[PDB]
């Protein structure tokens, strides 16, 4: 049971792991087939099915063994995880005329289990019908169902009837087998307590008392399997203590996997607010030896909205519900799960935790002190200026800057001003003085988990690095000795890694049961991987076959790193602009946690600088604007081992003592008097008195230097020290009153942050610099109007605006204009202001009557702990000073890009690139009117300054960020995407390996909008740049091309374009595309086809072959995309672009240029080839034709390549993209390509042209015959659950509607109709076969629609225009329907394939074809021939043609599609299409696919005698005696009921009848099914066809004159499986006919009543009373079946 539950959970995890979307569309098909052995006697059964709220109900049936074969559809749209938690409910009722319907049985199974089966469906299985209030009594019957789940792109499996599936429900064909137990499984989710729940109520209830930290009333709600259990509400407690078990329960086959714990703040007057949501995954805490789900006692961290309480609705409240990752810590909850395989009482759904468990849980919550450090290296790529930027580090609630704890946390950096990098971006100028953030937090020591997680992650990343080394080895075609050395290095590293012993879970308080189970599972997996590695090292030498096992090892290692008990909360770094939270980044705490067990047990970025991109608080990932690229060196660890921080510490940590001094101006002289309300000798505010003697060094610190003047030195920073080019910016300002007129502001010119600056006329270039532009100009490339102005508002007390918009409004009090142009190549220590405590600036003005100097003293660590003293600062400012700088030199080789978005109206863009690396940025050129630019540009950043040792740069390089932009001449430039990649760091000359261009993806939002071929290198610059390589050549001034060793090596290459034709050109502007032309551009070269004069008259290009010679790269990776444009030619010489496509996948185009028998009809063929009429039957004994049946489309058969192998189809696009998706499809270019390298020697002759033989490009008229066989499982379009389908075919301008020949009331219609049309290919190539619902009083609802490219049937290279049969036949029903004889088709494919034309022998027995001579005696060995066979030479030619891989005579199954459900099957349509071109003459006779009728039979029953009949149900006469008379009817024919004469006054149960019963019933021998058709009711508009198995009901009744007619027993005989009777009534007994429960009962002998004609014997009638079978009375019968002519030959009367 434990292993069964574990296998169930792992199966549902593996089956649900690919679905993550929040909405998804699904369809559930629930078919009920046959109920069997149902409880009760004389019952009247009906079935209701309830799926996901919707419900349906079968029509009413008869007897204890009903048959339905009725299908229901349930179309739902919800989360995939929600749908697997939903349930199917099959309920069986007994209807009544005057009462409500009573219940006997029920079955329930979730949608997840029927999704977990392969094919996403369980087919024709049996259910155990269980009474819900009487489940101890066992099964009260069985129910055969077949249920399907279809997702997007999924299809149902096909069906076969005689597939070991007819009957035999006993220990066979069950949905739930009897080997498993249907017991209850309970999970005891003990919920102990919670901590750090934020303020979620108003503070005005507390502050008028004159307890702000406890303003929440939390209770945890457990959502599991649709049920919700809420705990008690702890009023006014941010750290509640519930101590309550939640007893979740499931029936075993219907598991739910996702436990949802949601803490809610209870509100008396309003709705409950969401604190946070965490999930306990049952399959992640269980494994399949295996173990049941066990978890805890462990804290689960909650994440969601920021903790800062506002009375307003929270804009990030969706993060509290678990949607989105969460941006702030919302508390954590201590839970424990324990699985018991028992039925807990339902009254104990909520109960208190026992007191002994409360003492055990104390060892799982002991705290340990932790010290966290973060050295902020660089912050760059800032789009924002104004205010100031401060980074806050927090883990849990520790370090929360807005929290009202009294401790000064020092968890924030200082406020910094963004500085322009000269090109596009901004950066904080930290330089050699990095900010340092230190904080102290207390968490459980769970290092025994995170050490194993970190070591397994180190194993996984080493294995992934070696895997990528092997991939680059096999892709670069390296020598095999180096590949074997890399493989042996991989295997040796795996062997050395997986000998690692896991940390011992002994003697530690925080060890759980899940810790022991996970440790055992990890040790077993590591030992298995180690033994497989030792086996593989000596077993095999081929690295290609072994590589699939290495990926399995990496996937197994990825599964080992999962830790559900990671109670360490994430370190969240918040950028704060002004006082508002702006952007967040979440680093997992295990990624930076330090371990004393080694470097592998420590985190990947523990004590190492890492690049994190902060995100806006509801971004799935980075969008059009990144907030900041932040590089931070985070070291987390225990405070007891904080002395180990010195090895990870780079630079010297320095703290400062800070002090201010103030003076005022009296009588024209400065003096300390006049300070009204402020001290002489004080802080920055002036309200707190300090001294230089007050500040003293703490424990572990000493003074360095002396108390000195520090007037904020280096504030006039040199932002352009290492720059060869720069762009200066001065922001003109202008102010007005609201509603007034504009005038220049008092700060008429500022910098980007708002601090005042010089006028454009005042400033000059510095020495060593000169202007590139002669005058300033405003920037239109912003959020500004036509004159370069953005507009803002001022609210007091803020002097200047903080937000700006692009348009002028009357409430705007300010406006700002950015002026840019480019460039090439006091000492006393006091600051002055007009007011006391004001903003003191550099020099004294006329009104500055106050002054103030800033003052500092340096302080350095003293004791042996060194850099660990920053954790002992228990707040002054902590910084990290680097004593030296390392100069580097970065070169980015931006070669080209492909498949970019179209962001202009002319379906192209003008892409350029902003290449950014740390505090440096440069711009590539703009390539106009392309989506596949080739910049061919080397971007050189000379003399970039990176601090820290070069080894830390080599291990973790800063990222190079590639922001692509569509340039627009007006307005702001639009965003194309962002590519982040690392450069190749070179610290010396001996590792000078040439960098390799790679196709990094261009990330626009969550989808990949193209790729860019780009690489970078970062060379440690030596003395005077001597070790730097040579500068690249220049094709323009300051424009380097990508150098020869890094550029793809080009060779002369031919591109052949089969410009066949254009299809479905939608209208451009006000007119249709009448005069198009094709332009094919690749590699900078372009070719143009001839102009089609009229596309309507000629949809194909006259010159269908184009040729071009482009220098293309030898490497298949570096192949540029194939650009196609279509140019319409119009009046006034206008040539617009009316469509374009990009084909980046070109290796498909690579090629080597030098390389009882009178019933026989078509339905006999169909039933012999697709069904189970007769296994090895009479038809295949004659050896006639067999059809092929495809379960999918003919274009989805992989043998024929989708019928595009003549010419493929590429969709054209136009206009701007549809929110980063594809643009509007304005047509389809049809053609193919052949790319092959040309010889570089002109004396060598050219390779032959690959498009050798082409068909006629003029339009051809074709006779198209669409034979539609039948529909299967159509979506219902009526209120009764059925449909009235017909066929509507649209072919160009001709529409055939078969509405007058619809089929009434079926979901499996048998159409059997051929529709012959004429059309002109390829103008009318789009054949559209649609199914519509006949409706008398309403409009017709469309079932589905499928599209056939008839040009892909005609011009296909595999002969799909007519499927060739296996038999050349000239007469009868299998007559050759193709136009061409098999000799003509054989010589056609011979002229095709480069083969010689085949020669005919004189006697027709030999055909020589392609170097092989074929004989008719080869194929006709032991083959039966008949009179309808044709010529022997055509027979042999047809036998040869089937070995050529052509399309056989087939019935494809086309999926019906609809906009109601865009990728879900609305039904299936078995059919096929023959296309016959009229240039090849008339075709043969069409196949008569008209559906056969049901042959009428009469079932003849003789009622000889009866024996042992139960006594009569009493009446007024009241005597103890028996009444025997026999009723008889066939189900479906209850209007033809007949009865015998009543044998009254029986004394021993015997009655002599000699009666007869003649029941007319229709029959299909092929389907083995009876046919009955009737109207259901009075308002039934048309007749419904019902297909049921033929069966006979024979009942014993007991008539009374003085009372109602009464019933005794029933007997049922299947006409296909008639049970062989006993020859004597003594041998006839109860239960010789099968009883179906268990324990292998007697299988009765069966014989067919259709095959064996007549037999005589005895059969028992029986009933079920009180759950047990009762012998109701035997009856002697003779059963035989007559047909019509046998009935006229010998009538019975
Ligand atoms: C005098 C106070 C009466 C308060 C009467 C009262 O019931 O107020 C309820 C509302 C909302 O309070 P919640 O705790 O639901 O907010 C939950 C929150 N949106 C969240 O999601 O975090 O309070 C206000 O609007 C603030 C009024 C301030 C009035 C000064
Ligand atoms: C109450 C009077 C207006 C009723 C307007 C209206 O919507 O009628 C729809 C119904 C059902 O329409 P269908 O049978 O095509 O089922 C379609 C299926 N449910 C589906 O869509 O899948 O029509 C009638 O009952 C027939 C008489 C109509 C007389 C107007
Ligand atoms: Ca509240
Ligand atoms: Ca509350
Ligand atoms: Ca509320
Ligand atoms: Ca644009
Ligand atoms: Ca543009
Ligand atoms: Ca309808
Ligand atoms: Ca209808
Ligand atoms: Ca309708
Ligand atoms: Ca009776
Ligand atoms: Ca009677």
Author numbering: 174 to 383, 390 to 467, 493 to 1029, 1047 to 1095, 1126 to 1406, 1447 to 1984
Text of the article:
Ferlins are ancient membrane proteins with a unique architecture, and play central roles in crucial processes that involve Ca2+-dependent vesicle fusion. Ferlins, such as dysferlin (FER1L1), myoferlin (FER1L3), and otoferlin (FER1L2), form an ancient group of C2 domain Ca2+-sensing proteins present in almost all eukaryotic lineages. The top arch of the ferlin ring, composed of the C2C-C2D region, is rigid and exhibits only little variability across the observed functional states. In contrast, the N-terminal C2B and the C-terminal C2F-C2G domains cycle between alternative conformations and, in response to Ca2+, close the ferlin ring, promoting tight interaction with the target membrane.
In our efforts to identify an optimal membrane system, we observed that the cytosolic region of myoferlin (residues 1–1997) formed stable complexes with large MSP2N2 (membrane scaffold protein 2 N2)-based lipid nanodiscs, comprising anionic phospholipids and chosen to accommodate all interacting domains. We further stabilized the myoferlin-nanodisc complexes through glutaraldehyde cross-linking and imaged four different protein-lipid samples, which were assembled on membranes containing PS (Phosphatidylserine) alone or combined PS and PI(4,5)P2 (Phosphatidylinositol-4,5-bisphosphate). As observed in 2D class averages, the individual structural motifs of myoferlin are distributed in an almost coplanar manner around a ~30 Å central cavity, describing an elliptic ring that spans ~150 Å and ~90 Å along its long and short axes, respectively. In the nanodisc-bound structure, the cytosolic region of myoferlin engages the lipid surface primarily through the C2B-C2G, C2C, the inner DysF, and C2F-C2G domains, establishing a total of four membrane anchoring points. The local resolution of the myoferlin map enabled accurate modelling of three bound Ca2+ ions and a recruited PS molecule, revealing an intricate membrane recognition mechanism. Intriguingly, the modelled PS headgroup (C and EV1B), originating from the lipid nanodisc, binds at the interface between the L3 and the L4 loops of C2C in all membrane-bound myoferlin structures. In this configuration, the tip of the L3 loop inserts into the lipid bilayer (residues F1628, T1629, and R1630), contributing, along with the L1 loop, to the coordination of three Ca2+ ions. Besides establishing new interdomains contacts, the rearranged C2G simultaneously engages the lipid membrane with its Ca2+-binding loops and β-hairpin subdomain, inserting into the bilayer in the vicinity of C2B and C2F, respectively. Interestingly, our structures show that C2G binds more tightly phosphoinositide-containing bilayers, possibly because of additional interactions between its polybasic patch and exposed PI(4,5)P2 headgroups, as previously suggested and/or observed in other C2 domain structures.
